[PDB]
């Protein structure tokens, strides 16, 4: 948005996440051996999914992949889930030991309220499209105002992810999640999980390539699996 400052022929070029195929290319590039068994190509989709298309962390990964084996690569794939970006922070051509130090700043600049919406999008699902009202449950304040905060949030560090139709929905990626995991207040994780089971059951008393229907918002139990892990985190 700093460009709104300039009244001009402002022209823009956005550098999106390294797509799944290009990532392969990057590994291939510095000598990393390509998969065979199904749970190895899958191991590498774990890294690429986790490192939500990210040059820098992809690089922290390789540099920290020591013997080079898929075996030690999945070691890191575990280490990444239970210790955050801090599990893979390394000396890299990057100015930052890990992408979290970089994003910190991206988190400091933020409108105070937007800092809040962000602090909360932890209790979401990563790599999942969920409607504006399904977000209206956890975010501070017609709750369209939520979307304005969520646009500002993706516009200002590419922290979220907009998708206009089928229905106005947003999404949070994965690097951008484990930044928040080991970084938002250990209580506020469990508070967001709970403020959600509440407004969800409130949607309960009013009565793949597919968006979640309005007949079925009432059960985020669909993502029960990851919700169960995040819960094991906050509460201990």
């Amino acid at each position: 948005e700093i460009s709104n400052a300039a009244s001009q022929t402002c022209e823009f070029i956005e550098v999106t996440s390294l797509e799944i195929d290009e990532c392969y290319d990057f590994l291939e590039a510095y000598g990393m051996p390509m998969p065979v068994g199904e749970k190895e190509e899958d191991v590498l989709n774990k890294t690429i999914e986790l490192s939500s298309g990210n040059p820098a962390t992809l690089m922290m990964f390789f540099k920290s992949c020591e013997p080079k084996t898929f075996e030690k690569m999945a070691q890191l794939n575990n280490k990444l889930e239970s210790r955050g970006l801090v599990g893979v922070e390394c000396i890299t051509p990057y100015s930052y030991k890990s992408l979290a130090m970089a994003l910190q700043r991206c988190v400091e600049v933020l409108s105070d309220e937007d800092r809040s919406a962000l602090a909360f999008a932890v209790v979401m699902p990563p790599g999942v499209d969920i409607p504006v009202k399904l977000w209206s449950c956890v975010i501070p304040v017609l709750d369209d105002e939520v979307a304005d905060r969520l646009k500002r949030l993706s516009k200002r560090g590419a922290l979220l992810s907009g998708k206009r139709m089928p229905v106005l929905t947003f999404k949070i990626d994965h690097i951008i999640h484990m930044f928040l995991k080991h970084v938002v207040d250990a209580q506020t994780i469990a508070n967001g999980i709970s403020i959600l089971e509440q407004r969800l059951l409130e949607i309960g008393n009013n009565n793949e390539t597919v968006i979640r229907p309005e007949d079925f918002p009432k059960f985020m139990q669909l993502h029960q699996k990851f919700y169960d892990s995040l819960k094991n985190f906050a509460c201990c």
Binding site: Q104, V107, A119, V184, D185
Partner: peptide, 6 residues
């Protein structure tokens, strides 16, 4: 303490 530094 809601974050770190922040």
């Amino acid at each position: 303490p809601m974050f770190n530094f922040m």
